[PDB]
Amino acid sequence: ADNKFNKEQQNAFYEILHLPNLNEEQRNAFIXSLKDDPSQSANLLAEAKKLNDAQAPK
């Protein structure tokens, strides 16, 4: 776990991948913005986790 991105970007990557409430292809807008601009990774992470929270099973 290193030869992909930097610490923040990669941690964000796996955190977004860890999000089970997020739509496969929401996850894959985030992951595929992560890999256009890997400087938005923190924002993408925050939004993704937020949306994962919002999309929690009801």
CA distance 33 to 29: 6
Range of the domain at 23: 7-54
What sign for the dihedral angle of Cα 41, 33, 25, 54?
positive
Rounded alpha-carbon distances, angstroms, from residue 23 to 6, 18, 29, 55: 25, 12, 10, 9
The torsion angles phi and psi of 4, rounded to 5 degrees, stand at -125, -65
CATH of the domain at 27: 1.20.5.420
Q: Provide the number of structural domains found in the chain.
A: 1
What determination technique applies here?
NMR
